Design a protein around this nucleic acid. Structure first.
Ligand SMILES: [Cl-]
Ligand SMILES: [Cl-]
Ligand SMILES: [Cl-]
Ligand SMILES: [Cl-]
Ligand SMILES: [Cl-]
Ligand SMILES: [Cl-]
Ligand SMILES: [Cl-]
Ligand SMILES: [Mg+2]
Ligand SMILES: [Mg+2]
Ligand SMILES: [Mg+2]
Ligand SMILES: [Mg+2]
Ligand SMILES: [Mg+2]
Ligand SMILES: [Mg+2]
Ligand SMILES: [Mg+2]
Ligand SMILES: [Mg+2]
Ligand SMILES: [Mg+2]
Ligand SMILES: [Mg+2]
Ligand SMILES: [Mg+2]
Ligand SMILES: [Mg+2]
Ligand code: NA
Ligand code: NA
Ligand code: NA
Ligand code: NA
Ligand code: NA
Ligand code: NA
Ligand code: NA
Ligand code: NA
Ligand code: NA
Ligand code: NA
Ligand code: NA
Ligand code: NA
Ligand SMILES: [Sr+2]
Ligand SMILES: [Sr+2]
Ligand SMILES: [Sr+2]
Ligand SMILES: [Sr+2]
Ligand SMILES: [Sr+2]
Ligand SMILES: [Sr+2]
Ligand SMILES: [Sr+2]
Ligand SMILES: [Sr+2]
Ligand SMILES: [Sr+2]
Ligand SMILES: [Sr+2]
Lengths: 142, 142, 49, 150
RNA sequence: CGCUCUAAUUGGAUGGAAGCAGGGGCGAGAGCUCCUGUGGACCGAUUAGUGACGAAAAUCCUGGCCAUAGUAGCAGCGAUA
RNA sequence: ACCCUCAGAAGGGAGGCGAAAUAGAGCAUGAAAUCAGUUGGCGAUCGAGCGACAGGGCAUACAAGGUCCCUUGACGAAUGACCGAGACGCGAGUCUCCAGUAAGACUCACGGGAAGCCGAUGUUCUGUCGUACGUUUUGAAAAACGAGCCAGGGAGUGUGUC
């Protein structure tokens, strides 16, 4: 009579204190949007980042208010860079054989979208038993 | 029409600019001020020159306009507005919570803000807003 | 010779027009013109061995 | 063409549509805007008042140069577009008709929805001086109407 | 980083591929990925190649479209109907 | 097909076919510019590179993010007191001790709380900064040049030789 997601939906990974600290840091510090200059002034200009190249470019010249320019100083911490906000390390999965070798204590799995409903079912049940959380679970009615 | 002023200042024999400066800060601190006896407020200097400066403000103008007050009424009020960012929400709020009056329409007796008093026994070169308004051509309603 | 089969000429300055070879008011030959030549296309003379 | 842009319960609603009508699209927005909410009947009596010149239609958006009309309320500009009004009468005729053929009380029904949509232009050309010709087109208008039991 | 097509290895799809729309997550970023809806047949990854491979600009090209605007014109001519 | 409407072989309505008519004739898909209708936010006393970064209002079905707030406590970098005591200075004020103490960003734990609630997204308000972009130029917001808007098109290629 209600919807419920398959798998270990609530499972949390177990991280070292340092990792847990850095993950937390990442989440607190965040970063600027880094959208292409004036993408908002012209519809023919996408939000996709491009280096300001104008000799006179205000942003390129680094004027406060014209937005930040992409620099290595903005990189996230090596130790957590690329983790799901949960803390897990994502694993792209296309079939069941892809679940083999995965550690559910550290990694969580994400089933490709192309994968059909039939194969997702198998992959979803086999993943649960191996104790692996599936980030994009199927919601059934129980 | 009734003005629940938290503070009533007595401008009589007081240096206009200095009174204006404090009533400005207070208004910005949420205080509701009422400057009384505006006509008896005083500005220091050589009357001839002073009046020359206020007459020019009356002569200035064009189609856009430079409406400048002649009544001691207000302004004094204008003097205060020039110490307030009256074009910003907060500024306009403060300004609109300040009123200047000819004589004293209150039962109470305004207080004399410190540092704003002119000692007539030690000064000969000063003027009265009323004297200025009269020269400017205002009808001495007060 | 693809895109080069036309006598299109440019009007030059004078009519608030960009100097682009036109024919029958149709721009095109030039590479930036629809139906124009390819600027640097595949070439037979190239040794692909 | 268009498709009804609003849901309509078949058991308490009647629909109607105009297709590719060559008439002012600008006048159509004005009229739609004006009659929406009224009663099929009221609407008709109204459009007739307009075609007759006794009731003006407020031109709030496409009003450049339009002279003011005293009878217009809350606004100044609006006019009396009889052609578009007539086309709307044909629409309401159709609407109320259907409504009736279904059991409802055509006239009593409320104009729940009614919007005009520029469906295209019938192109034309007009010779100009200096050996040049310019566009001289006709708007093509679609319009939807939905009546609903009061 | 992204694009085309080739090859070896290896995967996904009518239990719904690509695309598109809105939305969630990751990456300093190029960009990657998931969800939902639409869609109704194709689509990838890795490695080595291939190049008619990346646009905001050129009075750039073609197509489409808005404001202009219900505006100017539908009067002027010795033929005022 | 049938029926209803209509001046009507038009169109419209209802209806039938098909997995699909939002497959009904330039009839697979159906982007942007853009139009109508409508929703959220703002709005008829107020100021203009349209935003970036902060922080408040209001708005939010699910999914794909799940955090967030207050007591207290732990840790506690640079920095770093009040009060009190004593002693100087014409004075504003200062020194010495208390004391590198109390305090001190982040993070964590206990207990209590939030689900439009935290993130996020839309819009709007406040703060700070801010006169596009690309080019030409010693110097561009420029009263120097280019573009109405969007989509798609649009520029280091081949041979020979060194
Ligand atoms: Cl790096
Ligand atoms: Cl004036
Ligand atoms: Cl101001
Ligand atoms: Cl004196
Ligand atoms: Cl139109
Ligand atoms: Cl930390
Ligand atoms: Cl090069
Ligand atoms: Mg844009
Ligand atoms: Mg060609
Ligand atoms: Mg007019
Ligand atoms: Mg001729
Ligand atoms: Mg391989
Ligand atoms: Mg460019
Ligand atoms: Mg392109
Ligand atoms: Mg063009
Ligand atoms: Mg005009
Ligand atoms: Mg005659
Ligand atoms: Mg189609
Ligand atoms: Mg020069
Ligand atoms: Na003076
Ligand atoms: Na004046
Ligand atoms: Na030819
Ligand atoms: Na060859
Ligand atoms: Na108007
Ligand atoms: Na009126
Ligand atoms: Na009226
Ligand atoms: Na042009
Ligand atoms: Na907000
Ligand atoms: Na130039
Ligand atoms: Na410039
Ligand atoms: Na200039
Ligand atoms: Sr899918
Ligand atoms: Sr002060
Ligand atoms: Sr010339
Ligand atoms: Sr208008
Ligand atoms: Sr190219
Ligand atoms: Sr037009
Ligand atoms: Sr005539
Ligand atoms: Sr039907
Ligand atoms: Sr200004
Ligand atoms: Sr310490």
């Amino acid at each position: 009579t209600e919807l419920q997601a398959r798998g270990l939906t609530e499972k949390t990974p177990d991280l070292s204190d340092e990792d847990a600290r850095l993950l937390t840091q990442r989440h607190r510090v965040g970063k600027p949007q880094f959208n292409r200059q004036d993408h908002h002034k012209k519809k023919r200009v996408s939000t996709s980042w491009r280096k300001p190249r104008g000799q006179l470019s205000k942003q390129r010249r680094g004027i406060k208010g014209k937005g930040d320019t992409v620099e290595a100083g903005f990189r996230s911490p090596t130790a957590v860079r690329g983790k799901h906000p949960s803390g897990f390390e994502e694993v792209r999965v296309h079939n069941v054989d892809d679940l083999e070798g995965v550690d559910g204590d550290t990694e969580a799995v994400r089933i490709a979208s192309k994968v059909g409903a039939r194969k997702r079912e198998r992959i979803e049940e086999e993943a649960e038993d191996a104790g692996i959380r599936v980030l994009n679970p199927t919601y059934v009615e129980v | 029409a009734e003005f629940d002023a938290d503070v009533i200042v007595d401008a009589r024999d007081c240096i206009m600019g200095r009174v204006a400066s404090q009533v400005a800060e207070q208004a910005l601190d949420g205080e509701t001020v009422a400057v009384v006896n505006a006509e008896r407020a005083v500005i220091t200097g050589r009357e001839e020159q002073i009046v020359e400066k206020y007459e020019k403000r009356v002569d200035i103008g064009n189609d856009n306009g430079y409406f400048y007050p002649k009544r001691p009424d207000g302004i004094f009020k204008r003097t205060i507005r020039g110490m307030l960012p009256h074009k910003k929400q907060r500024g306009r709020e403060a300004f609109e919570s300040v009123r200047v009056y000819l004589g004293n329409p209150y039962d109470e007796d305004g207080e004399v803000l410190d540092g704003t008093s002119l000692d007539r026994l030690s000064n000969i070169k000063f003027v009265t807003l009323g004297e200025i308004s009269e020269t400017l051509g205002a009808n001495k309603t007060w | 010779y693809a895109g080069l089969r036309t006598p299109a000429e440019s009007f030059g300055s004078g009519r608030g027009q960009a100097h682009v070879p036109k024919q029958d008011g149709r721009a095109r030959r030039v590479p930036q013109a629809v139906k124009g030549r390819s600027a640097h296309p595949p070439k037979t003379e190239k040794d692909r061995s | 063409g268009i498709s009804y842009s609003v849901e309509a319960d078949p058991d308490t609603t009647a629909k109607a549509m105009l297709r590719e009508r060559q008439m002012s699209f600008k006048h159509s927005k004005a009229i739609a805007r004006e009659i929406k909410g009224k009663t099929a009947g009221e609407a008709v009596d109204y459009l007739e008042a307009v075609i007759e010149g006794d009731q003006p239609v407020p031109f709030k958006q496409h009003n450049s140069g339009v002279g003011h009309k005293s009878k217009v309320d809350g606004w100044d500009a609006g006019r009396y577009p009889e052609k578009a009004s007539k086309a709307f009468l044909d629409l309401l005729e159709n609407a109320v008709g259907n409504a009736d053929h279904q059991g409802f009380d055509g006239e009593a029904m409320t104009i729940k929805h009614v919007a005009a949509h520029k469906v295209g232009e019938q192109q034309g050309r007009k010779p100009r001086a200096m050996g040049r010709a310019s566009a001289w087109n006709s708007p093509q208008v679609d319009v939807e109407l939905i009546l609903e039991e009061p």
